[PDB]
Amino acid sequence: SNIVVSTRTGEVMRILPRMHEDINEEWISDKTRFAYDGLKRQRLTQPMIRNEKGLLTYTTWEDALSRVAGMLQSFQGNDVAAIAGGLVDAEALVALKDLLNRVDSDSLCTEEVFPTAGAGTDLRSNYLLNTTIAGVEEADVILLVGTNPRFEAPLFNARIRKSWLHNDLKVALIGSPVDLTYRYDHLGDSPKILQDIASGNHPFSQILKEAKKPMVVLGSSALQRSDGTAILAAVSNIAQNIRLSSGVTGDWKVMNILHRIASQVAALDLGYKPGVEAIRKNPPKVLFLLGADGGCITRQDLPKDCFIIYQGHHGDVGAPMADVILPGAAYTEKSATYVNTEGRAQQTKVAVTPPGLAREDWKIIRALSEIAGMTLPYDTLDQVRSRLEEVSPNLVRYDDVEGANYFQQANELSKLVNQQLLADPLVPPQLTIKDFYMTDSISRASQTMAKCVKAVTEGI
Amino acid sequence: QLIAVDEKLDITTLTGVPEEHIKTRKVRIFVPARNNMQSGVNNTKKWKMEFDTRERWENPLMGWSSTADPLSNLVLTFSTKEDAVAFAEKNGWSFDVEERKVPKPKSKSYGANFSWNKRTRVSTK
Amino acid sequence: TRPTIRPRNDVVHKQLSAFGQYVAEILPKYVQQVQVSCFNELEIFIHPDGVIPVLTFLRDHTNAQFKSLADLTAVDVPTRQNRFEIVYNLLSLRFNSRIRVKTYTDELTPIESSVTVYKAANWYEREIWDMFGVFFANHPDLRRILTDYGFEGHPFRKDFPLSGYVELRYDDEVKRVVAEPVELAQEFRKFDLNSPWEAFPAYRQPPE
Amino acid sequence: LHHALIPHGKGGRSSVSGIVATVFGATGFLGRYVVNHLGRMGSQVIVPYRCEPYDTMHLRPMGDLGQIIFMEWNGKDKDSIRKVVEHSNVVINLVGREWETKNFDFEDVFVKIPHAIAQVSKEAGVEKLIHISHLNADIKSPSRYLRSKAVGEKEVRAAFPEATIIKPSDIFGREDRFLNYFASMRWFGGVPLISLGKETVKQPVYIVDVSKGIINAIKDPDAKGKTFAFVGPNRYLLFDLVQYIFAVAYRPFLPYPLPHFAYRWVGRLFEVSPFEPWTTRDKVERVHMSDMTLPHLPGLEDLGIQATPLELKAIEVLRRHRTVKPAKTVN
Amino acid sequence: GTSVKPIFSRDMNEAKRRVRELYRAWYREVPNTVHLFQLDISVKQGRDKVREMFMKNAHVTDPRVVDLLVIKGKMELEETINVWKQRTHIMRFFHETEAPRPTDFLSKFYVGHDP
Amino acid sequence: LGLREIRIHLCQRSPGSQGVRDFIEKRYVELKKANPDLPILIRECSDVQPKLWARYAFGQEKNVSLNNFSADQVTRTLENVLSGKA
Amino acid sequence: GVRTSPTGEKVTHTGQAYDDGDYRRVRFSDRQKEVNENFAIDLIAEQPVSEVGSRVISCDGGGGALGHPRVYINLDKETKTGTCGYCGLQFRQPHH
Ligand SMILES: NC(=O)C1=CN([C@@H]2O[C@H](COP(=O)(O)OP(=O)(O)OC[C@H]3O[C@@H](n4cnc5c(N)ncnc54)[C@H](OP(=O)(O)O)[C@@H]3O)[C@@H](O)[C@H]2O)C=CC1
Ligand SMILES: [Zn+2]
């Protein structure tokens, strides 16, 4: 969602919505509006290393960068790995990818899991919201699978509500009956219903068949479970049946995937491996935590004396387990590229500079590459964005949301594996409003969100 | 009486701007977004050129906000996008252009509030 | 109109309109436009080539004889292809009247100096050259008049920063006054004062 | 690094460098240059003074608003030293005197005061201490000045084991006592040099070089327990050095050899005066003594400074002494 | 098309002739300026400064810009010869009180956020 | 010497990418059936010649233009890159 | 209502005091720190609550035109008291 950051005398004062008809219209979510309080708390301001007692102590940039570069030169290939968090920009992602490639390491992972079988991240449309947010206004039936749009993508849910109110949109949900602020049809909780829809016994298959502009939306939260591949295959089967029966109405792009974190689409565009299973299969000896605060990988899953580097802006679950801490910039303190769930690339602007000794993330990675002798070609932001264009040229088109549809190839490639579904009801992580306020490191450091959580849990 | 010389205009050597405030700066050319606190649209008529934000720090005495870049307060107004682009190119500034956002026209209907069968029917007024 | 409103003067308005039409008729080679404001001020917009003729006419014609040059200055409008507009204010004591003559130029096109018509222009053009960088051809001696010696740039340009690029102090190591890049202990506070909800409907522009 | 001491800005007058320096002896010759270099990059300077505020007035414009704080002190009192160094992370010692007063001998100035400063700074938690001695300091020197300096180095190192010792060699500059002392001999006509000034070799160093060296020693992280020797690029016999000085000043040169004993007697006569002496027994011995050579000691080049030769700054120093053929060097 | 009114020179050749004339005048003036203002620089480095200032504008290919620069340089020479400038104005070309700014990436990364 | 990944940058509506487009529509799947662990990232250019990037060990990359190639031409280029022969 | 910081400095009504490691304290040595001893929050907390038998009351701060803009305060909520937004005076209806 487009926003205006209002600052004064070098301090962020408030966040206001910025009008964009296609994405957020005129509104922002409560978290978007009020979580900027966390930007002033628990911040990383200086490089830190471990002393003889094993405690974290301040040091200069040269010391920490040389300490990281020594281990980067000592190990190579499979022994080096990196994990990207949910608030990472494309510039830092591509810089980290290049740095690890110069070591001959391909284990660049994200905390969010997307199934790699079949096409995987090979075809972009396999992991995008192809209908787009605005396209919800042209739909007539929408089927939601294993997601809570109200809390995962509140403005997407607002668009669905607007279509429901003005276009008489029909909404059906497979999962736990969460409150969506509009009435819908609850098909059930078992994932097997998807197959029952794909087979054709469920009457909702007929409802989808008669539709002129049907929509199927699968959330990434449902992909976070072990049946992500099978659930994606079943949803692809439903969409394929819809196309084969109802025919090609044109460029409608029935299949859709709703993402929850800001960095996921850019990372998948840049070739990052979704999920962290590569790290579990081959544990590394030096691990880069680029804003990774999900707790997916701990020291227990790692070998003894694993060298962990944390680069970020907040002191949270990822920092205290690190050997070297590199203070980075938050999204309000850099000009950085983010790709939304639609596949649309957008860029932020600098509102304030990073506090203390914190620096721009891709600048940190480029300096580390120079200290380690594997110097990266780019020196300025324009050159890093040229590199991004070299890797994924859609990352420099700053408002484009159009793209090619490759549903057919991805659909046949999803019929190779035959993973089975478990009898586990689809339960989203956000069941109620109290689960919505605290999701990332910025929101966890906010007192406004803590007050909101206290108010919703007990009300006066 | 006329030279008829063919070359793009460049006045950087005549403006007196220091070298590192020409090539390192990145201007933004845009129509400013409407302040969402108000409904008036009179502030979204012209194009603006503004420079990139630089470091701001705290004065050790009085805790005031101190800066070191001379272009922190420079904003220019232009009638069209083309005029601003021409100004930036002739002044040697790298620029980013953002296309103007216009609120699309909408279908309003007071009677739709009292709908017989559609969901547009309101519960209170 | 009640006591709080400035009274109008139709007689002077008619006289100024008639004299503007007269001037435009006599010199159609240079006069591009003639306007009279609602507070009875006459301006004549001319081509840059006609600075010497038109002024001479307005100084020497028996019916005009604007013998006094009140002021000569420039205005910087960056959105225009011709950036600078040159404004001459002339006073006629014989007919107790004032006139304004406007022309235009850009950063590189020189404007003919008018010191041969009015001696008073000598310093005025110098000031323009100092503040806007407009060159005047055939000026007796064109140089800076207001800025410090060796000052770089032209401060009255819109893109010139308010505090400039350099500041001065005394250094004891070199025992002299030195110039260094500007650094403010408190940055000038930029205020966004313009409100939405336009004030004057009579000046509304077409929405194109 | 104590967030308030995190550097900010572009290294200018209103920037923050993260340096809080207490500069003892800042009202002297090298003190003004050290304070100016500290203040032009945005550091806070505490200037302890024992003289009249009027004599410290010239240091006021060297910093931004509030960046220079003046404090009364005296070397006989440890509490004034404590209150002056409580909040600093850098302490620089520049206290010195080329003659002995009725209240302070060389022992007080170069041994007791530096030892007290180092001890109080170590107790106060000061991170860095920078002490100035002489290049020709040794415990067996004929002059008490140099002997005291050698003793001072030993006590400063003992009290502050991580102190940086800097050993300049006859600093020259606009307010120096080297070029001005040699050029101030015009009043007495022919210059007097022991053995015609042909037996002693000098290696003078520019004042700005020494000040920048102190600044870079503050900046350098690994220059904690090191000892540096700040010397110029060229070595000169004293005779030809004085000849060059007089040639630059356009003054007539009439050097006459003088007996060492005779020279000492002349020095003693100057000492009795209440006012500062042009020359002293210790001064004539110090200028007659040759400059040491310490190749093992890290130099000014080790701090990223190319030493400026005397030929470039001699005109600047000696133009006021007026009303081309640089000297030959030995290396 | 692209027809514009001249200032002094019709093509680049006349512009370079004017540039060479101004350069000769500055080169001649340098020693007298050094002596008159009692500068501690040498004549050689003063002429090097003149050369550097001329070379700063070596990329201009527009005759109007060239002779406007020539006009400004002639104004500067007029200020210098008539002793309207003081010693500080002349010495401002050398930036002796400014600490040097490193150009490499690592140093800029260390000192701050400014590219 | 080991190939790490392949990237195909093609334009959506341009004639010069047309053959490349056909390639995908006909045989990308088959290629993916033969190389189940090789990432072939398909991305979109705009107003730009089609390109094929190949990344080898230690970050070495080579790019070859695919402008106006037919489907067989890009198939031959991909086979040459994949087999390792120039 | 001036308090004392553990270091020894007086805490101002805004609550500011340099921490122990703060070098800026050096500015107060041989000098003093300007602190206002009259804390407005305590002083206004000492004013008694006015008892008025009206649902709405007007406040101008006293002194007529020498006060603040006149504002009207509602006293329907019995749990709390009405407070002037300019002056801080408190008003209440006579419960029981
Ligand atoms: N040629 C040179 O200058 C060389 C100098 N050095 C060393 O460098 C240091 C600085 O030299 P320079 O600047 O010439 O010295 P100056 O004589 O110019 O000044 C020394 C400073 O110390 C202060 N001071 C002197 N005696 C006392 C005392 N008893 N109590 C308190 N303060 C005192 C003085 O303050 P006040 O003015 O109030 O008396 C003065 O500001 C000296 O310590 C010297 O030994 C080393 C080698 C060569
Ligand atoms: Zn009141």
How is chain D split into domains, by residue range? 1-331
Query: Which residue from A289, A353, A297, A370 is spatially nearest to A326, judged by alpha carbons?
Result: A289
Return the axis-axis angle of helices D207-219 and D29-40, rounded to nearest 10°.
50
What ligand has the least distance to the C-alpha of G50? 2
Exposed e or buried b per residue across F25-38, where buried means at least 16 C-beta atoms within 10 angstroms of its C-beta: eebbbebbeeeeee
Q: Does C206 touch chain B (CB under 8 A)?
A: no
- Atom 3, ligand 1: which residue's CA is nearest? D171
Residue B14 located in a structural domain = no
Technique used: cryo-EM
Exposed e or buried b per residue across E33-53, where buried means at least 16 C-beta atoms within 10 angstroms of its C-beta: bbeebebbbeeeebeebbeee
Whether A173 and A146 have beta carbons less than 8 Å apart is answered as no
Residue type at position A189: D
- What residues form DSSP beta bridges with B29? B49, B97
And the tokens for D41?
A: 């990059």
Query: Which residue from A176, A172, A103 is spatially nearest to A141, judged by alpha carbons?
Result: A172
Whether B28 and B40 have beta carbons less than 8 Å apart is answered as no
Residues A111 and A288: their CA atoms lie apart, in Å, by 13
Residue type at position D206: Y
The reply to whether ligand 1 has any atom less than 6 angstroms from the CB of D30 is yes
**Alpha carbon separation from B44 to A21, A350, B96 (Å, rounded):** 16, 22, 18
And the tokens for D177?
A: 């006592």
Which residues surround the ion ligand 2 when the cut-off is CB under 5 Å? G 59, 61, 84, 86-87
Residues A215 and E3: their CA atoms lie apart, in Å, by 60
Residues D327 and D234: their CA atoms lie apart, in Å, by 10
Whether B66 and C187 have beta carbons less than 8 Å apart is answered as yes
Residues F43 and F41: their CA atoms lie apart, in Å, by 6
- What residues form DSSP beta bridges with A317? none
- The chain F residue lying nearest A406, using CA atoms, is F25
Contact D174 C170 (CB under 8 A): no
Contacts of D80 (CB under 8 A, 6+ apart): D48, D71, D72, D73, D74
E105 sits in which H/E element? helix E105-111
- The chain C residue lying nearest E90, using CA atoms, is C150
Q: Does A60 touch chain D (CB under 8 A)?
A: yes
The reply to whether ligand 1 has any atom less than 6 angstroms from the CB of D94 is yes
Given resolution (angstroms): 2.4
The reply to whether ligand 1 has any atom less than 6 angstroms from the CB of D50 is yes
Residue type at position C6: R
Residues D35 and A372: their CA atoms lie apart, in Å, by 38
Residues D127 and A328: their CA atoms lie apart, in Å, by 28
Exposed e or buried b per residue across C136-145, where buried means at least 16 C-beta atoms within 10 angstroms of its C-beta: beebeebbbe
Q: Does D221 touch chain A (CB under 8 A)?
A: yes
Using an 8 Å CB-CB cutoff, list chain C residues near D36: 171-173
Residue B65 located in a structural domain = yes
The answer to whether the annotation marks G96 as part of a ligand binding site is no
- What is the 3 state secondary structure string of F25-75? HHHHHHHHHHCCCCCEEEEEECCCCCEEEEEEHHHCEEEEECCCCCHHHHH
Q: Which runs of consecutive H residues, i.e. helices, occur in A372-429?
A: 381-391, 407-413
Are chains F and B touching, using the cut-off of 8 Å on CB pairs and a minimum of 3 such pairs? no
Whether D71 and D56 have beta carbons less than 8 Å apart is answered as no
The answer to whether the annotation marks G13 as part of a ligand binding site is no
CB-CB: which of E40, E99, E111 is closest to D315?
A: E40
Residue B12 located in a structural domain = no
For chain F, what is the domain count? 1
| Domain G40-92 indexed as CATH 2.60.260.40 | yes
Phi, psi for A134 (deg, rounded to 5): -65, -35
Whether D136 and D281 have beta carbons less than 8 Å apart is answered as no
CA angle D162, D167, D168 (to 5 degrees): 145
Residue type at position G49: V
- The chain D residue lying nearest C177, using CA atoms, is D61
Query: Which residue from G27, G86, G30 is spatially nearest to G62, judged by alpha carbons?
Result: G86
A338 sits in which H/E element? strand A337-339
Residue type at position A154: P
Query: Which residue from D180, D111, D98, D170 is spatially nearest to D135, judged by alpha carbons?
Result: D170
Which atom of ligand 1 lies closest to the CA of D172?
Answer: 1
Question: Helix and strand tally (H, E) in chain E?
Answer: 5, 0
Q: Which runs of consecutive H residues, i.e. helices, occur in A124-227?
A: 149-152, 154-166, 192-199, 203-210, 220-223
CB pairs under 8 A between C and D: 31
- Atom 16, ligand 1: which residue's CA is nearest? D28
Residues A146 and A220: their CA atoms lie apart, in Å, by 8
What ligand has the least distance to the C-alpha of D50? 1
Residues D97 and A300: their CA atoms lie apart, in Å, by 66
Contact B5 E2 (CB under 8 A): yes
Query: Which residue from C184, C166, C171 is spatially nearest to D35, judged by alpha carbons?
Result: C171
What is the DSSP code (8-state) at residue B52?
P
Pocket test for ligand 1, best of D24, D36, D70, D97 (most atoms within 8 A of CB): D97
Residues A98 and A92: their CA atoms lie apart, in Å, by 10
G73 sits in which H/E element? strand G71-74
Give the Å distance between the CA of C99 and the centre of ligand 2.
Answer: 58
Contacts of D241 (CB under 8 A, 6+ apart): D182, D197, D202, D204, D327
Q: Identify the CATH number of the domain in which residue B107 sits.
A: 3.30.160.190
- What residues form DSSP beta bridges with C112? C137
**Alpha carbon separation from D63 to C135, D41, D47, D68, G55 (Å, rounded):** 41, 9, 12, 6, 62
Give me the torsion for CA of F20, F26, F31, F32, rounded to 10°. 100
Using an 8 Å CB-CB cutoff, list chain C residues near B15: 153-154, 157, 159
Residues A239 and A197: their CA atoms lie apart, in Å, by 10
Residues D211 and A80: their CA atoms lie apart, in Å, by 47
And the tokens for D241?
A: 């050095």
Min Cα separation A76/chain F (Å): 10
Query: Which residue from D81, D147, D91 is spatially nearest to D116, judged by alpha carbons?
Result: D81
Residues D144 and C194: their CA atoms lie apart, in Å, by 76
**Alpha carbon separation from A426 to A104, A117, A144, A296 (Å, rounded):** 39, 21, 11, 21
- β-pairing verdict for A3-8 and A11-17: antiparallel
Chain E residues interacting with chain D (CB cutoff of 8 angstroms):
38, 40, 97, 99, 111-112, 114
Residue B2 located in a structural domain = no
Q: Output the DSSP codes for B10-47.
A: --HHHH---GGGTSS-EEEEEPPPPPTT----TTSSSE
Chain G: partners with 3+ C-beta pairs within 8 Å? D
- What is the 3 state secondary structure string of chain C? CCCCCCCCCHHHHHHHHHHHHHHHHHCCCCEEEEEECCCCCEEEEECHHHHHHHHHHHHHCCCCCCCEEEEEEEEECCCCCCCEEEEEEEEECCCCEEEEEEEEECCCCCEECCCCCCCCHHHHHHHHHHHHCCCEECCCCCCCCCCCCCCCCCCCCCCCCCCCCEEEEEECCCCEEEEEECCECCCCCCCCCCCCCCCCHHHCCCCC
Contacts of C2 (CB under 8 A, 6+ apart): none
What is the DSSP code (8-state) at residue E94?
T
Whether D69 and D93 have beta carbons less than 8 Å apart is answered as no
3-class DSSP state for residue A418?
coil
Give the Å distance between the CA of G53 and the centre of ligand 2.
Answer: 18
Q: Output the DSSP codes for A42-109.
A: SB--S-EEE-TTS-EEE--HHHHHHHHHHHHHH--GGGEEEEE-TT--HHHHHHHHHHHHHTT---EE
Residue B58 located in a structural domain = yes
- The chain A residue lying nearest D1, using CA atoms, is A58
Residue B8 located in a structural domain = no
Give me the torsion for CA of A427, A430, A434, A437, rounded to 10°. 170
And the tokens for A239?
A: 């969409």
Residues E2 and D312: their CA atoms lie apart, in Å, by 54
Whether G21 and D1 have beta carbons less than 8 Å apart is answered as no
Give the Å distance between the CA of G54 and the centre of ligand 2.
Answer: 16
Residues A253 and D296: their CA atoms lie apart, in Å, by 78
